[PDB]
Amino acid sequence: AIQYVRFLETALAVSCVNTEFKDLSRMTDGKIQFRISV
Amino acid sequence: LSEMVAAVSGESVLKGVSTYTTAKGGEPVGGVFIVTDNVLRQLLTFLGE
Numbered sequence: 810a811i812q813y814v815r816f817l818e819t820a821l822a823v824s825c826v827n828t829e830f831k832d833l834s835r836m837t838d839g840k841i842q843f844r845i846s847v
Numbered sequence: 848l849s850e851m852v853a854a855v856s857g858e859s860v861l862k863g864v865s866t867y868t869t870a871k872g873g874e875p876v877g878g879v880f881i882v883t884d885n886v887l888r889q890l891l892t893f894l895g896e
């Protein structure tokens with residue numbers, strides 16, 4: 810009784826924003842720097 | 848009755864068995880309730896349509 814499930818078809822995917830990055834294992838660290846003037 | 852229908856598993860290992868259909872067609876027949884006569888009359892009173 811198999812049923813295949815796709816990530817994009819489930820509504821849970823509206824939460825996340827999804828990009829395909831070809832070589833993640835070589836990637837060591839990643840950062841985001843926000844600059845907010847108040 | 849919906850809880851009773853929910854209790855029965857919806858998975859058949861043969862995975863593709865053809866179905867019986869309503870006279871209007873389209874959606875298939877899911878189950879059979881077997882009752883007695885007074886029970887049948889009372890169920891048709893409570894559930895119309």
